[PDB]
């Protein structure tokens, strides 16, 4: 017993600085106009703006009919930005969020908005909480239905660079994929007994999954429906993971409950723990990298971690 028992090695540098936002509401999403100017959104109609790359954030309160909205998603492409939330709401800007307008949503939308993606120049795509997919090309005046066959309330949803999506079923029994041209989601059975929690895309054309009990896997490069070995980054089942994101093609971060944050420098094969952030009293729900030297992790109760290059 000459090395610490049951642990994984501790990372040599902690790049994450903890920030307390001027709120205790949960933050759900973030998007940048450029390197310095960006927006974040969350629960209770929370909206904040940064002009310094996300070091400091200023609350903005829109005078809406009520403040119970859960702002689920924000997306900018240059100065054009969009926010969606539940109960159904859509906000739009063309000036970097200096003025926002509410876009009326068709009451026949199946489910409430879950995700919006700005495509620039008046175009955007929206997905509802039950997987209906719509696109606008005219700044939200008209929406074309791409998928109307609903799939139940998705547990998680992620997008690839080419506009594919992957959605985990409500209770993690299976997952579904969609790409442009398809008229419905395609279901795929899970490949572990443990239920799926989250799935997304790697920067090399594969899928990743997080499953119950702190395990992860990656799809086969030759066949995205074949899956590799089930990995245990923390060598245990007690700590669940919530999100996985790549800073670079080889450097991967894995965020989970109760201060858990791990990094792999070999593409996800082996992991080391960022022990400094174990002191932060928060689950780490979402990792957002905007470039290799700008990134954020969403905690609870207004906690943010901000990436600071060594």
């Amino acid at each position: 017993l000459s090395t610490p028992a049951l642990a994984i090695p501790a990372l040599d540098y902690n790049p994450w600085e903890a920030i307390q936002l001027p709120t205790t509401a949960t933050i759900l999403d973030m998007s940048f106009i450029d390197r310095h100017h960006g927006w974040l959104v969350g629960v209770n109609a929370t909206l904040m703006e940064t002009r310094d790359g996300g070091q400091t954030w200023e609350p903005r309160t829109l005078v809406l009919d009520h403040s119970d909205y859960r702002f689920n998603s924000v997306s900018f492409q240059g100065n054009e930005g969009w926010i969606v939330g539940e109960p159904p709401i859509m906000l739009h800007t063309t000036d970097g969020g200096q003025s926002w307008s509410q876009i009326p949503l068709d009451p026949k939308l199946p489910g409430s908005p879950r995700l919006i993606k700005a495509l620039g120049n008046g175009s955007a795509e929206m997905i509802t909480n039950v997987g209906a997919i719509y696109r606008t090309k005219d700044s939200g005046k008209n929406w074309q239905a791409l998928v109307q066959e609903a799939i139940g309330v998705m547990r998680n949803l992620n997008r690839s660079p080419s506009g594919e999506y992957v959605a985990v079923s409500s209770r993690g029994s299976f997952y579904s994929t969609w790409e442009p041209g398809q008229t419905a989601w395609e279901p795929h059975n899970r490949t572990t007994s443990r239920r799926l929690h989250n799935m997304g895309f790697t920067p090399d054309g594969r899928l990743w999954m997080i499953v119950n009990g702190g395990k992860i896997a990656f799809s086969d490069p030759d066949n995205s429906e074949n899956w590799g070995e089930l990995l245990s980054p923390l060598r245990r089942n007690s700590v669940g993971f919530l999100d996985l994101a790549y800073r670079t093609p080889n450097e991967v971060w894995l965020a989970g409950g109760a201060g858990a944050l791990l990094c792999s420098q070999d593409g996800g094969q082996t992991w080391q723990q960022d022990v400094d952030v174990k002191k932060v009293p928060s689950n780490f729900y979402k990792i957002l990298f905007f470039s290799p030297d700008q990134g954020f992790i969403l905690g609870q109760k207004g906690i943010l971690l901000r990436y600071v290059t060594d």
Partner: peptide, 6 residues
Amino acid sequence: FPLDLA
């Protein structure tokens, strides 16, 4: 018409 800030 655009929204007000509080």
